[PDB]
Write a protein that binds this ligand. Structure first.
Ligand SMILES: NC(=O)c1ccc[n+]([C@@H]2O[C@H](COP(=O)([O-])OP(=O)(O)OC[C@H]3O[C@@H](n4cnc5c(N)ncnc54)[C@H](O)[C@@H]3O)[C@@H](O)[C@H]2O)c1
Ligand code: FES
Ligand SMILES: [K+]
Ligand SMILES: [K+]
Ligand SMILES: [K+]
Ligand SMILES: [K+]
Ligand SMILES: [K+]
Ligand SMILES: [K+]
Ligand SMILES: [K+]
Ligand SMILES: [K+]
Ligand SMILES: [K+]
Ligand SMILES: [K+]
Ligand SMILES: [K+]
Ligand SMILES: [K+]
Ligand SMILES: [K+]
Ligand SMILES: [Mg+2]
Ligand SMILES: [Mg+2]
Ligand SMILES: [Mg+2]
Ligand SMILES: [Mg+2]
Ligand SMILES: [Mg+2]
Ligand SMILES: [Mg+2]
Ligand SMILES: [Mg+2]
Ligand SMILES: [Mg+2]
Ligand SMILES: [Mg+2]
Ligand SMILES: [Mg+2]
Ligand SMILES: [Mg+2]
Ligand SMILES: [Mg+2]
Ligand SMILES: [Mg+2]
Ligand SMILES: [Mg+2]
Ligand SMILES: [Mg+2]
Ligand SMILES: [Mg+2]
Ligand SMILES: [Mg+2]
Ligand SMILES: [Mg+2]
Ligand SMILES: [Mg+2]
Ligand SMILES: [Mg+2]
Ligand SMILES: [Mg+2]
Ligand SMILES: [Mg+2]
Ligand SMILES: [Mg+2]
Ligand SMILES: [Mg+2]
Ligand SMILES: [Mg+2]
Ligand SMILES: [Mg+2]
Ligand SMILES: [Mg+2]
Ligand SMILES: [Mg+2]
Ligand SMILES: [Mg+2]
Ligand SMILES: [Mg+2]
Ligand SMILES: [Mg+2]
Ligand SMILES: [Mg+2]
Ligand SMILES: [Mg+2]
Ligand SMILES: [Mg+2]
Ligand SMILES: [Mg+2]
Ligand SMILES: [Mg+2]
Ligand SMILES: [Mg+2]
Ligand SMILES: [Mg+2]
Ligand SMILES: [Mg+2]
Ligand SMILES: [Mg+2]
Ligand SMILES: [Mg+2]
Ligand SMILES: [Mg+2]
Ligand SMILES: [Mg+2]
Ligand SMILES: [Mg+2]
Ligand SMILES: [Mg+2]
Ligand SMILES: [Mg+2]
Ligand SMILES: [Mg+2]
Ligand SMILES: [Mg+2]
Ligand SMILES: [Mg+2]
Ligand SMILES: [Mg+2]
Lengths: 71, 108, 17, 168
RNA sequence: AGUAAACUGAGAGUAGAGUGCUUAGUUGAACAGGGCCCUGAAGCGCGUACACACCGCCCGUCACCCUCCUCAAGUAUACUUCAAAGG
RNA sequence: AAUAGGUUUGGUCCUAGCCUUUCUAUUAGCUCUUAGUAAGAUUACACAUGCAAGCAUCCCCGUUCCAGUGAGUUCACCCUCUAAAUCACCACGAUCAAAAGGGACAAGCAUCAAGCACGCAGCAAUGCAGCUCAAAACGCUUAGCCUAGCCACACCCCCACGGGAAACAGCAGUGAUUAACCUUUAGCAAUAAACGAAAGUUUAACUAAGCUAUACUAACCCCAGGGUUGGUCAAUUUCGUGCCAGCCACCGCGGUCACACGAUUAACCCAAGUCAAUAGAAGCCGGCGUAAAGAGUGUUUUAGAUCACCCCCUCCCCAAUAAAGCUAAAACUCACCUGAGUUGUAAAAAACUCCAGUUGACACAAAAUAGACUACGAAAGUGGCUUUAACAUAUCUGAACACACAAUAGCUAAGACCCAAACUGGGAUUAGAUACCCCACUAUGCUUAGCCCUAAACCUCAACAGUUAAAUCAACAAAACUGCUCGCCAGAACACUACGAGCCACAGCUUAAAACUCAAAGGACCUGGCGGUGCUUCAUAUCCCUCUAGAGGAGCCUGUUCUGUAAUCGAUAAACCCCGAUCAACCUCACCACCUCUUGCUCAGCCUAUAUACCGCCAUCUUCAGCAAACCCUGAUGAAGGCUACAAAGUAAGCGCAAGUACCCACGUAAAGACGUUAGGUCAAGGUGUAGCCC
């Protein structure tokens, strides 16, 4: 068979890889911001739990970890 | 698929039908913003009279004005219906001749 | 660019006659 | 074509051909059958062919199946009183199994005929209403009675538009 | 091959007009083997996204251009939830 | 989607979307006679005014109903238990029917996958740690519903103490708003409800009217309109227009013959309607080698299947895997001797010259021959030697995510480094060369320990079981199928993308949309064209060389081009260019300037346009040998194809070639030379279609 469908996919992937290459510094700043909001959204979900259960502060000795950082 | 698979998936779900430019409505009222002509896509050759109107829904759209000769002007009221102009890409609305400020085509 | 009609769509009146 | 072997089983006509309508005492029917063995062949055909018909006629009776739990196939019925009815089906054909449980726990043809008659009392022919519940909607449909004004206009004398006009 | 080459005459058409054309004759050769890049044909194949038929079709950057969407700093607005509780 | 139809291609078949035809509703345009009947804000936005609940010897009862709306939305159904209410009173019941308890009960999204206290035991104290959930919990979004009717709501804060605030979602009516638009009528006579002991009283419930082609039914002396008329699809004459104006549901139409545009004529269909827009009605038992689809591999879970007992025939070995050890050939390096060059290719340059050749020593790299074998392993992979360990399951099926793997490339750290080698540098090529060609060298290919988790991970054939008889079968691939199960798919493109989530991944992987756009996209095959396409044999004055005389340089002659001129036209690659002309000083003559004539040499005339309307006569391949009616057969009766002589489906009239004839023969030269190719040449030989001119 012909490879015309593969050729369409080939160009789409080449242009995408090149686009990501050109903007990899902007995309890295955007990704960093999303992970911060993701962490904040996670901390809120846990705070909602103890607050809806009648507690006024987090359980004694509980520190919400950073589960989205590269470290 | 097997009977067990057909049972587990259930009856087919139709895609929710896509509302057109009239948003599932027969006609819409619009206010003319500007008038101009559009070139039909090849192989057709013409200067098709179109206009941009603000629809009652708030969204602005390009509408084809059918017939030979019109007198539409900015700030005038027109009624627009569905129906694509086959040779005008993106033109999916048509002005209703004989309603509000758009009159009937003058004979010959 | 003179429009070239499709040969399969070419109309004929043999039946109409 | 319809998927599976014996697609007739998945038709409303087939499912309505069951003759076993359990008495109200029957609450649960367990079927213990074996996948292999020549002596359990009727029990396999009974599960294959007749369990769907039994369930169709007895939607509120729990039917549970158990494979290869014992050396021979048997049916056990649990009644509301607390009584249990063990039916040994080894060596019996599927048709004999259906005939057996019909005799010992199925409603006779007389008891079923009566129920059908009591249902006919619910749709009285003399009643008028929507076609869903009644044969006729209005007395105007009866020949000899004053027809509907939608089909035949009434005399001016029988119309309120003209009774008041003369009176006024 | 009486060919090429050379030489000589006649005719058509004009009132006249060609170094042109048509045609008759004279003298009168050399070579004819070997090859298939090229040119073209024949045969048998192979591929084909072209069919306006390779002067074909066709991909992408950039330019212009309209329609739609995504991301996005700071900020504002609106909405949702609470008492489904405790003393 | 059906009795189907149209639409992809040069063509055929297949697949597939879109659209047509049918039936309703709403709105728009245009049009419209009557009667009867039914039905009738777009808006849970704001409302002027009037009315919509009274009754009755005071108490009470009623105003908790009816009427309205569709905002919200699994309080509607069944069962159990049991209030209020009806049966004057008791009902020891029936009827009706709350609260409570049990069960059942919409759609879409899994890119909402975890919820976060959601359970149990105990008299209590208290103890246990459970409960829901891919068979869809939790969550988001949408929607009144299952219509003798039911549910919900009643301006908002779910509620209505309270607060905001001052309420038509009661009838009639109004404003705003929307494509959407009924009277500010009458009567309590009928029925229903309230009240009364009752005669009765009241009620915008309701009844009877008003308004409206939204529908139904009936009628019309008189009075018909709307749309359509290229195909689908019933039905077009004459003009105008000339890719413009416009048209089109789809395919498409429009550049001088427009049945498709506009007008006009006629016709077709329906008809007091017509039919433009919109919406709805008809959607899974079909597929997954190549069209969308078998996800790289195996396992199992809750389950499903009957392929599990019976009932049986490929255990061991060959290139599985892991570990350790080992080395034959060839490199590299070093040493001696010798040589002065070696390397590089179509050819060069650059590079090296402690270089090359012989001999010897020599690896953490890679594994000729066997292997023409077709084995091992789940797949990926696995082919030098030895040894150790070792290749799950006595029914099958069973995961993007669980579990464990998974070439090459790549990442992190420490090593090895012969050779190869991205990148980079140099040489050359080129219009350019960030390439192809040459040289050097690095990451990398190796080892160790961690990652990453992709492939055209492909026999492009899911696992298991069974069959070879049916129809063999769209096509090609790989003969055609059945049972059963899981996975997956539902026009193209957007998109191996966006967002979400997960991940040792951070320029990544996995899962994976939508908006705008289109009428196709796509699969297989056939034909043609073309190929910097293969092989083979050829051209006889012939493609190259060979033979002879020329052209190309000079002058002249002549044609054309260009320039010039007030001043023809045609030919114009082969197949124009001493060509139409076997011929222009006037004439010829068709051109230019000036002057003149107007029924004109002609029952006019035109060398005006169109050779892309033609006849006529020709060029061209042809320095060919084929064209072909009528039949027959093959391919499943697909587009297509049809020959074998020891013959296997072709027979063929006619035409051409041939034969014959002309010239001096039977040789040669002429003549002849089909169909078709170039819309080839000629409207200016003459004739002529169409269009144009007529002082
Ligand atoms: N998700 C479960 O834990 C679960 C439990 C019981 C049965 N199953 C069965 O697994 C099949 C797949 O279910 P789905 O479509 O809802 O899941 P899915 O394939 O959409 O996967 C969603 C989740 O289920 C897991 N899952 C996928 N396949 C599974 C399988 N075969 N068994 C168990 N877990 C699986 C995935 O890892 C993931 O966590 C069905 O046949 C279902 O009945 C699944
Ligand atoms: S339906 Fe009976 S009178 Fe109309
Ligand atoms: K179709
Ligand atoms: K009272
Ligand atoms: K609602
Ligand atoms: K409310
Ligand atoms: K009354
Ligand atoms: K038409
Ligand atoms: K070896
Ligand atoms: K392959
Ligand atoms: K070909
Ligand atoms: K010369
Ligand atoms: K001709
Ligand atoms: K002529
Ligand atoms: K002519
Ligand atoms: Mg692309
Ligand atoms: Mg249209
Ligand atoms: Mg109307
Ligand atoms: Mg009571
Ligand atoms: Mg209740
Ligand atoms: Mg899933
Ligand atoms: Mg998303
Ligand atoms: Mg709603
Ligand atoms: Mg209100
Ligand atoms: Mg309220
Ligand atoms: Mg009102
Ligand atoms: Mg209306
Ligand atoms: Mg009373
Ligand atoms: Mg009325
Ligand atoms: Mg089209
Ligand atoms: Mg035409
Ligand atoms: Mg015309
Ligand atoms: Mg027309
Ligand atoms: Mg595919
Ligand atoms: Mg596979
Ligand atoms: Mg894959
Ligand atoms: Mg398994
Ligand atoms: Mg798997
Ligand atoms: Mg799954
Ligand atoms: Mg994957
Ligand atoms: Mg790997
Ligand atoms: Mg590596
Ligand atoms: Mg090297
Ligand atoms: Mg370079
Ligand atoms: Mg290296
Ligand atoms: Mg090694
Ligand atoms: Mg492979
Ligand atoms: Mg499988
Ligand atoms: Mg798609
Ligand atoms: Mg990829
Ligand atoms: Mg991605
Ligand atoms: Mg993301
Ligand atoms: Mg010369
Ligand atoms: Mg000339
Ligand atoms: Mg010319
Ligand atoms: Mg010419
Ligand atoms: Mg030519
Ligand atoms: Mg003269
Ligand atoms: Mg002259
Ligand atoms: Mg003249
Ligand atoms: Mg010609
Ligand atoms: Mg002869
Ligand atoms: Mg000749
Ligand atoms: Mg001849
Ligand atoms: Mg021509």
């Amino acid at each position: 068979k012909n490879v015309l469908k593969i050729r369409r996919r080939k160009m789409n992937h080449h242009k995408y890889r090149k686009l990501v290459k050109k903007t990899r510094f902007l995309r890295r700043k955007v990704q960093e911001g999303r992970l911060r909001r993701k962490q904040i959204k996670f901390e809120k979900d846990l705070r909602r739990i103890w607050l809806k259960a009648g507690l006024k502060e987090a359980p004694e000795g509980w520190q919400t970890p950073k589960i989205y950082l590269r470290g | 698929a097997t009977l067990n698979q057909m049972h587990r998936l259930g009856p087919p779900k139709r895609p929710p039908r896509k509302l057109g430019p009239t948003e599932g409505r027969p006609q819409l009222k619009g206010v003319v913003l500007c008038t101009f002509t559009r070139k039909p896509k090849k192989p057709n050759s013409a200067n098709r009279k179109c206009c941009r109107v603000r629809l009652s829904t708030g969204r602005e759209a390009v509408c084809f004005i059918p017939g030979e000769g019109h007198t539409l002007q900015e700030h005038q009221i027109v009624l627009v219906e569905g129906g694509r102009t086959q040779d005008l890409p993106g033109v999916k609305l048509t002005v209703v001749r004989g309603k509000y400020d758009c009159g009937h085509v003058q004979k010959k | 660019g003179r429009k070239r009609a499709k040969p399969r769509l070419e109309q004929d009146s043999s039946l109409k006659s | 074509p319809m998927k599976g072997r014996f697609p007739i089983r998945r038709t409303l006509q087939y499912l309505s051909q069951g003759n076993v309508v359990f008495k109200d005492s029957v609450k649960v029917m367990t079927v213990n059958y074996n996948t292999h063995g020549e002596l359990g062949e009727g029990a396999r055909k009974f599960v294959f062919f007749n369990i769907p018909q039994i369930q169709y006629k007895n939607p509120w009776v729990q039917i549970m199946m158990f494979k290869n739990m014992t050396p021979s196939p048997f049916l056990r019925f649990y009644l509301d009183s607390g009584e249990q009815v063990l039916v040994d089906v080894e060596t019996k054909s599927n048709k004999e199994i259906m005939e057996h449980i019909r005799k010992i726990l199925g409603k006779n043809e007389e008891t079923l005929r009566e129920e059908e008659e009591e249902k006919k009392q619910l749709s009285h022919p003399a009643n008028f209403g929507p076609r869903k519940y009644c044969l006729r909607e209005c007395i105007c449909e009866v020949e000899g009675q004053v027809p509907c004004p939608s089909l035949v206009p009434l005399p001016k004398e029988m119309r309120g538009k003209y009774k008041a006009a003369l009176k006024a």
